[PDB]
């Protein structure tokens, strides 16, 4: 990792992150065979089997009722991202719901537990059968429940049953609680055997396959499930796994803290509002403004392209000489000098103005330094902690190359506009000069 302190604006840009960006969805359609359960009835009295059976049949009968429905940039982007995801998933479920497609899916899963299927709407879904409960119900439990008597002396039957239905009951809980669209792929929607098997079937390059098989917790975390329905005594649902059609491109993260100067004792503060993740995608700079969008694993940042807003390629001029590019770098400005620490990956920005006493120290030595007034950049090599008054921040002990891009801060070199002095999320030349 690399990190430039941009002295001109009290903001770091951290570079050398690689990219993984979701660009499509892969559909795995699971036929969980609940089995013959609605032909078994305990009728003798209270019993272990009756209780598990009633739960299983009650859950199944419940599930039949469950169904799905068949500028401040952050709020915009994360609005679109979720709307796009559900619409992409629902559009496929709405093909699979057709009885011609379910019966095709079910039929190709007759003698194999895994099938590749092409829907009439052309999507080449994978299909999977889960039968562990059906096999138990058909071979064991149907033979045990003689003539509706079921308080049998075999407790191994009843304890066994409470294991096999456990997955089914968990699937019902998750779809019913979420009204048919789960936010993430639980171990009960897709076990880790099936995720690895589904990943290995994706129509993707082996680089993505290896990367996905390593980061499979992220693949699980980005995907989501939709309930198709209950058909016969199979619940049918589907899991939209991500396809990471962009990888290995540059990304960087911009952090900022308030830059201020006491012009005649009045703090002309400025803060960059264009903070957050940026990536190059296919020859376009893409900005991911919402904090849910992107997550790191080492150098890899896992973003969603549906959350990205394209920004002009000139926008990196805001990281080189924001003072003097004509691109409209977004800032806030105003009178009040907030003093704060912004923890970057390889260090901390420390905004420290009149009032608070800021210091940096190491566990070996205590206070190493009292920081000057004004924004300072503390590499994670300079100290182990920063303090702001009595508040102590532990710094991220991480190897990387820090840099300083020197320059007199804008706040200290341009004059603030007399009125309005406080302006939120404006192009910089509206605050200064």
């Amino acid at each position: 990792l690399k990190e430039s302190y941009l002295e001109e604006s009290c903001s770091t840009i951290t570079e050398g992150y690689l990219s993984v960006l979701r660009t499509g969805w892969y559909t795995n359609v699971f036929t969980l065979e609940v089995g013959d359960v609605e032909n078994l009835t305990c009728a003798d009295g209270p019993s272990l089997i009756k209780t598990e059976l009633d739960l299983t049949k009650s859950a199944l009968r419940e599930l039949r009722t469950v169904s799905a429905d068949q500028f401040v940039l952050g709020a915009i982007a994360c609005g679109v991202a979720t709307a796009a995801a559900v619409t992409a998933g629902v559009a496929i479920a709405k093909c699979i719901r057709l009885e011609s497609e379910v019966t095709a899916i079910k039929n190709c899963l007759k003698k194999t537990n895994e099938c590749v299927s092409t829907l009439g709407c052309g999507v080449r879904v994978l299909a999977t059968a889960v039968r562990e409960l059906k096999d138990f119900v058909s071979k064991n439990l149907t033979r045990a429940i003689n003539k509706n008597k079921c308080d049998i002396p075999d407790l191994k039957m009843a304890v066994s049953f409470s294991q096999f239905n456990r997955r089914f009951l968990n699937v019902v809980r998750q779809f019913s609680d979420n009204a048919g669209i789960t936010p993430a792929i639980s171990k009960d929607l897709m076990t880790d055997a099936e995720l690895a098997r589904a990943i290995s079937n994706m129509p993707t390059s082996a680089g993505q396959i290896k990367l996905m098989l390593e980061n499979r917790a992220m693949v699980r975390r980005k995907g989501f499930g939709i309930l198709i329905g209950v058909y016969g005594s199979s619940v049918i649902y589907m899991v939209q796994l991500p396809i990471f059609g962009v990888i290995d491109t540059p990304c960087w993260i911009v952090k900022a803290a308030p830059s201020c100067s006491e012009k005649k004792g009045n703090y002309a503060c400025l803060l960059r509002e264009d903070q957050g993740w940026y990536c190059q995608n296919a020859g376009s700079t893409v900005y991911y403004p919402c904090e849910k969008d992107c997550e790191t694993r080492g150098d890899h940042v896992f973003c969603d392209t549906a959350a990205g807003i394209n920004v002009a390629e000139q926008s990196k001029e805001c990281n080189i000489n924001i003072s003097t590019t004509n691109y409209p770098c977004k800032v806030s400005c105003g009178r009040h000098p907030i003093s704060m620490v912004a923890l970057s990956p390889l260090g901390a920005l420390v905004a420290c103005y009149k009032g608070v006493s800021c210091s940096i120290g190491s566990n070996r030595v205590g206070i190493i330094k009292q920081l000057n007034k004004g924004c300072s950049y503390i590499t994670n090599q300079d100290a182990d902690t920063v303090t702001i008054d009595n508040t102590v921040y532990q710094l991220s002990k991480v190897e990387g190359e820090q840099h300083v891009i020197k320059g007199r801060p804008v706040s200290s070199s341009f004059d603030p506009v007399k009125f309005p002095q406080d302006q939120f999320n404006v192009a910089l030349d509206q605050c200064f000069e």
Epitope: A43, K57, K147
Partner: antibody, heavy 120, light 105 residues
């Protein structure tokens, strides 16, 4: 069409023997349980018991266990209900009814009821 | 035994009326409740099974619902042939007690 025609209407002195009959037809007789249901005149229905003709296993209501018996002539698709001693209280209409499933225990096809009357 | 209280013991209604009948077990019977119509001088006829499901060829004006202990049955618009006595029946455990039977006239 599944149809369960019954014996008819029968008159007895108390303590006489009697058997009702139900010639089921239109389905494979062994695969469904035959229930017997009693209705005292204008009163509620009372489930008396059932037989599985596949093996003549029987359940009874505790009220009737050991008073009535349920049987089948599997050879002629015919169930029976039989009393040792008819009490004069035991005058009612009796319907045999096919139990619709081994899991979903409703009674789907009902015989035309047999009147039994028992007095002296 | 599950006792099957059923109310009201009788009804009267116009054609078109959304009459409703209730059955209430003495225990939990899950959803194992059936409803029968008996026309006068006829053997009973099943209308609903499993608390909620229309038997085949039953007119879709009939309906029911509920679970656990309280169940209801509704004729969403009564018709002149629907005059008769209605019985609930649990099958959650042996013996399969019928309800008291509610006469609709």
């Amino acid at each position: 069409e599944v149809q369960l025609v019954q014996s008819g209407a029968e008159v007895k002195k108390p303590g006489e023997s009697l058997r009702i009959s139900c010639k089921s037809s239109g389905y494979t007789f062994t695969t469904y349980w035959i229930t017997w249901v009693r209705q005292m005149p204008g009163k509620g229905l009372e489930w008396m018991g059932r037989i599985d003709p596949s093996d003549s296993y029987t359940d009874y209501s505790p009220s009737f266990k050991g008073h009535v018996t349920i049987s089948v002539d599997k050879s002629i698709n015919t169930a029976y209900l039989q009393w040792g001693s008819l009490k004069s209280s035991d005058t009612a209409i009796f319907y045999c009814a096919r139990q619709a499933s081994s899991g979903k225990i409703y009674f789907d096809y009902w015989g035309q009821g047999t009147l039994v009357t028992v007095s002296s | 035994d599950i006792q099957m209280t059923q109310s009201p013991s009788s009804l009267s209604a116009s054609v078109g009326d959304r009459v409703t009948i209730t059955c209430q077990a003495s225990q939990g019977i899950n959803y194992y409740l059936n409803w029968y119509q008996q026309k006068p001088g006829k053997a009973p006829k099943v209308l609903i099974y499993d608390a909620s499901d229309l038997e085949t060829g039953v007119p879709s004006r009939f309906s029911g619902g509920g679970s656990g202990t309280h169940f209801t049955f509704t004729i969403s618009s009564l018709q002149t042939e629907d005059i008769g006595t209605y019985y609930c029946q649990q099958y959650d455990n042996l013996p399969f007690t019928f309800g008291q039977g509610t006469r609709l006239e």
